[PDB]
C-alpha cells in the first residue's frame with residue numbers, strides 16, 4: 001500500500017501537479033482504486049488537458065472516477081479521432097461534463113446528422129462542437145429543424161452559422177425575434193436568386209443583444225407590443241403543432 | 245427462395261425474398277466412433293439431438309430425408325458398420 | 330482477365346526490380362481508379378522501413394554508414410543506400426544526409442532522454458519532447474507507415490506511462506507506445522512542394538491521365554443537396 | 570514487419586479434405602479407380618512418387634546440408650564478379666599488405682634509356698589504338714566488349730616485338746582460360762580466392778625480388794587501416810558448402826609455372842556493369858595475392874611463416890582507355906595475425922592512354938572541328954606498360 005502511494009505521487013509530480021493540487025485529487029476520490037485513479041488522469045492528460053483544468057472537472061463531477069478504464073480509452077480515442085484535442089477539450093468538458101458518461105451512439109448519429117443531413121464540413125462540425133457543447137443533449141429532430149429554419153427562412157449559409165454560434169440559442173427565442181422582424185418588414189427572406197431588396201440585419205444584433213436593445217435598434221417598437229406578439233405567436237405554434 | 249408482398253399488402257409490389265438459417269459451429273463427441281467432430285449445425289439440430297438423447301441416437305434414428313446431409317449419412321454408415329462388425 | 334501482381338518477390342535486395350504499371354485497373358480488368366496510365370518506365374527499389382533490423386548473427390544497437398543518397402523515381406522522398414556489417418539496404422534520407430555519414434540505430438530505452446541526432450533511429454521514449462520525428466510506426470515491429478512523404482515532419486508532444494502522443498502533419502494526434510522506433514528529423518526534398526510542373530507534357534511523364542471533360546455539376550450538387558422540411562418546403566425558392 | 574510477396578501471387582492452399590476421411594473404420598470411395606477426376610467423388614490421396622532412375626534432364630539435387638562437401642564454418646569466396654565496397658582499402662586489409670604509390674624504380678629504369686624504346690613507338694601505338702576502335706570491323710562504332718580485349722592483345726604483340734633486342738623474351742607465353750585458387754585466414758575468417766578471366770603471362774623464371782630485407786622488415790611499424798561500420802568480408806560470396814584447396818591451375822611439370830603478369834579486362838558495354846576504378850584495382854590486388862599465395866604454398870609448404878624468398882607477381886588492368894598498373898610482392902604466409910611483417914604492393918592509378926576517341930568527324934556549321942582519331946594521347950602510359958612487360962626479362 002505504501003509503495004503504491006509513493007509511486008502515484010511521483011507520477012503526478014512528473015506529470016505537472018503541485019503538492020497543493022495533488023492532495024485535493026485525493027480528497028475528491030471516494031473509494032476509487034489508486035491504480036484506477038492513476039490511469040484515469042493518464043488518459044485525461046494524454047488527451048491534452050492541462051493539470052489544473054483536470055482538477056476542476058473531476059472535482060465538479062466525481063462520478064467520472066467510478067468508470068471502467070477500458071471505456072475511457074475508447075471514448076478518448078473517439079474524441080481525438082473527430083478532431084477534438086488539446087485546448088478544445090476544456091470548453092466541451094466544462095459546459096458538458098456528462099460527455100464521458102453518455103454512449104458513443106448518440107454522439108455518432110449527431111455528427112452524422114451534421115455532416116450528412118445538415119451537410120457540414122469536417123472542420124465546421126469540430127468548431128460547432130467546441131463553440132457549442134450544448135448540441136449533444138437535445139434530440140436530433142429539433143436541431144435539424146433549427147438548422148433548416150436558419151438556412152431557408154433566414155437565408156444564411158454555413159460559414160455564417162458556424163461563426164455566429166447560432167445553434168446554441170433557443171429555438172423559441174429565435175422564432176419570436178425573426179418572425180416579428182419579418183412581419184415588421186425589417187427582415188426579408190432571400191429569394192431564389194439570393195437577392196434581398198432591403199439590407200438584412202446582421203445575425204449578431206438580432207440574437208446576441210438583449211431584447212431591450214434589440215427592440216430599440218432593429219424592431220423600433222414598444223415593449224408591450226412585443227409581449228402581446230409573443231403570446232400571439234405562442235398561440236399559433238401550439239395550434240400548428242396540434243394540427244400537425 | 246420466394247416472393248413477399250410489400251407491407252403484407254396484396255396491392256403492393258412483389259419482391260424476391262431469401263431466408264437463411266442461423267449457422268453455429270459446435271463440438272460433438274461420438275461414443276461409437278470415439279471421435280470429436282466439429283460440424284456447423286443449427287438450433288434445430290441441437291434440439292433434435294437433445295430429444296434423441298445423444299448424437300449417436302440422433303444419427304442412427306433419423307432417416308435420410310430428414311438428415312439432409314451427406315456428412316450425416318456417412319456418420320450413419322460408419323456407426324452401422326462398427327455395430328455390424 | 331489473366332492479371333498477376335508484379336509484387337511477387339520474396340527476398341529483399343538492393344537491385345532495382347522491374348515492375349509493370351496497372352493503369353487504374355483492378356485484377357478483373359475494369360477501371361477502378363481514373364486518371365492513371367502511361368508515364369516513364371520505372372524500376373522499383375525495395376525500401377526497408379524497419380530501421381532497427383539487426384543481422385541474424387548480431388543483436389542490439391549497431392552503427393551504420395551511409396554510402397550514397399540518390400533520387401527515387403517511385404516516391405517524392407530521396408532514398409539513401411546505407412551499408413552496415415556485411416549487408417546493404419535502402420532507407421529514406423532526411424534533410425542532411427550525404428556520403429560518409431554514420432548513423433546509429435538503437436532499441437535501447439534510457440532512463441534519461443538521449444540527445445537526438447539527425448537520421449538516427451531511437452525509441453519514442455528515449456527522445457526529448459518536441460523533436461522532429463518521421464517514419465513512425467503504430468506498434469513495435471510493425472514498420473514505418475506514417476510521415477513518409479518528402480519534407481513531412483511529426484513532433485512528439487508528451488509521454489505518459491508507456492504511451493507517447495505524436496502529432497501527424499495533418500494536425501491530428503496519435504497514440505503509440507515508447508517501445509516503437511522512429512527516426513529523428515524531417516524527410517528530404519523539402520522544396521518538393523514548391524516545384525512547378527511547367528507544361529501538361531510533364532504531368533503525362535509522371536503517369537497521370539487528364540481529368541474527365543464532363544461538367545460534374547450534378548456530382549457536385551449531389552454531395553451538397555439538402556432535403557427541405559415540410560414546414561420549410563414553402564421557403565426553398567421564393568420567386569423574385 | 571512488412572513481408573515481401575503478396576498473398577495473391579503465393580501458392581494457393583490445397584482444398585480441404587473430405588469429411589469421409591475423418592470417419593474411423595470407413596473406406597472412402599474416390600475416382601482413383603477410373604484414373605480421372607469427377608466432381609461427385611471423394612478426392613483420393615496419393616503416396617509420394619519417386620522416379621527410381623537417374624535422368625539428367627529431370628534430375629533433382631539433394632538438400633544442401635546433405636552434400637558431402639558441407640561445412641558449418643562459412644567461407645567467403647572472392648571471384649571475378651565480386652565488387653568490393655571499400656575498394657583498395659578493403660583489399661589491403663584482406664591481403665595484409667602495405668600500399669606504395671608509384672612503380673618500383675628498377676621496373677621504370679628499363680624504359681628511361683632510349684635503347685629499349687621501340688622504333689616509331691608513338692606511331693605504332695596510335696595506329697594500334699585507331700585499328701582497335703575505328704578499323705576493327707564493318708560497323709562504325711565498335712562496342713566496348715569488342716575493342717577492350719583487342720587493344721590489350723595488340724599492345725602485348727607490340728611489346729613482344731622486342732625479342733630482337735632481348736632473346737630472353739622467348740621464355741614467356743600468354744595463357745588463356747587459366748584459373749587458380751588459394752585459401753587462407755584473416756583473424757579466424759576462412760577466406761578463399763578463385764581467379765578467372767583475362768590472360769595469364771607465364772614465364773620459366775620467377776621474378777626477382779623488388780624490396781630489400783630492410784624494406785620488408787620496415788612493414789612491422791606500418792599498421793593496417795580499418796573501417797568499423799563495414800565488415801571486411803562485405804560484398805563477398807559466403808557459402809557453407811565448399812572445399813578448402815590451393816591450386817595454381819596447372820599440373821606438375823608445366824614448362825611455365827611462374828606467373829609473370831595478370832591482365833584483367835573490364836569489357837562491359839553498360840557502365841553499371843563496369844567496375845569502378847577503385848573496385849577494379851582491388852580485383853588486381855586480390856588476384857595477384859591469390860597467385861602469389863598459391864605459388865608460395867605449392868613451393869614453400871602449407872606452413873604459415875615469413876618467406877625467405879618473396880614472390881613477385883605483376884598485374885595490369887584496363888577498361889579500354891584507362892589503365893592501372895600493380896606490382897605485388899608476397900613476403901609472409903602467416904596472415905592470421907595483423908601484427909608483424911606485411912607484404913608490399915606498388916600501384917599506379919588512372920593512367921589514360923587517350924582522353925577520347927572520335928570515330929566520326931565532327932561537323933559544326935559545315936566546318937570540320939575534331940578529326941577522326943585519338944584525343945590527348947599520352948605516351949607515358951605505354952612506357953609504364955612496356956616497363957612492366959620488360960621487367961625481369963630485360
Ligand SMILES: [Mg+2]
Nearest residue numbers: 541542543544
Ligand atoms: Mg471541366
